[model samples]
Target: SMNPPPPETSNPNKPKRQTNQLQYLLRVVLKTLWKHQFAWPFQQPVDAVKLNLPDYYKIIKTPMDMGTIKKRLENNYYWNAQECIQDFNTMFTNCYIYNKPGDDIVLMAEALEKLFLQKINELPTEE
Candidate 1:
């Protein structure tokens, strides 16, 4: 009586095409960011209440984070590599703007930004 219903055809797991290959390249870079040493803070959205930074929302209107980025990626929100890169850029820029220079968080952002840029350049461009 506890048998689960058979899985219905949903997305059908569409096969990756040429465009998807390019997206895969961006996913690789995003996964690298996830494993980075200082990725903890940016993994999820900031808790303005817990962190006690009342002004956070005011400063970072388009706050971006790794977890959110991945969700967007999985949802096929990014059409290309550059568009995906912009979210990473937004995340780092928000960090740089909100956090004080030379702070530990800022340092982590700097390190990750450098690594991300380097990884992004690894992608092969289509002619």
Candidate 2:
């Protein structure tokens, strides 16, 4: 069968109740990133992570939590809207830094980057 087995039942399908809404917004943004030619930002494929986050997000997730959040917050996992935006910015930066004119991948990545930035701005910011 071509179908893969279902994911573990414990996974959070939507944003966790304690999770920040920015995290949910970033998830949408990351999924959009995956559709482009951004093979540089992530060492691992997008589907490898349960939440479909970039490999960098997964690596930085723990430290960003342990460093700033830990006991200061009560959430099971750490969440920071600013850092998420930074990572998105990094991806966009790389898209241009390594861009090659007339390449379909670069064009697509640039267009998606602009679209995602617009969408991220549309999301409400708390603070």
Candidate 3:
């Protein structure tokens, strides 16, 4: 059974809250990082010397459609907070189960905290 669509806002004529442009940048950053980290087989190995500055900047200007939250959830994926939490959990569990060295565990934690958690926590939210 399909869920009903969300109700229309009470004030149809009222303008929606303005979206911040930074939100798109944040999405792009998170998406690129997640792809590099987890979707390894699908991506070419990162080669800094072969950098294409024009193409890299072009990506930011392109539209990113993340589809529905439900769809992302179904795939155990999304772009922001929930995705960050899940990604951390998966990495931590793998580190533990595989008996990763202490330094590796510490490095993974630090990377996630610095690269993901800080920005995710800073986003304005209804929480």
Which candidate number has the best TM-score? Answer: 1
Candidate with the greatest lDDT versus the true structure = 1
Model 3 stretches astray by more than 4 angstroms: 1-29, 35-84, 103-109
Tens digit per residue, CA lDDT, model 2, 10-119: 33443433445455553565555545555333323223255343443333322211112222123333245564565456544554454457766466656766767777
TM-score of each: 0.78, 0.45, 0.33
Candidates' C-alpha lDDT? 0.72, 0.44, 0.37
Candidate 1 per-residue lDDT over residues 15-76, each given as its tens digit: 32335534654467778888988999998877776777888887777877887777666765
For model 3 the local lDDT of residue 73 reads 30
Give per-residue CA lDDT, model 3, range 1-106, as digits (tens).
2222322213345433323323432464346444545333112321223543233322222112212222233333333444434534444443344334675544
Q: What lDDT is obtained when candidate 2 is compared to the true structure?
A: 0.44
Candidate 3: worst 10 consecutive residues by lDDT?
Answer: 61-70
lDDT for model 1 comes to 0.72
Clashes of 3: 0
Give the poorly placed runs of model 1, Cα more than 4 Å off. 1-22
Q: What residue pairs are clashing in model 2?
A: none
Local error of candidate 1 at 10, Å? 16
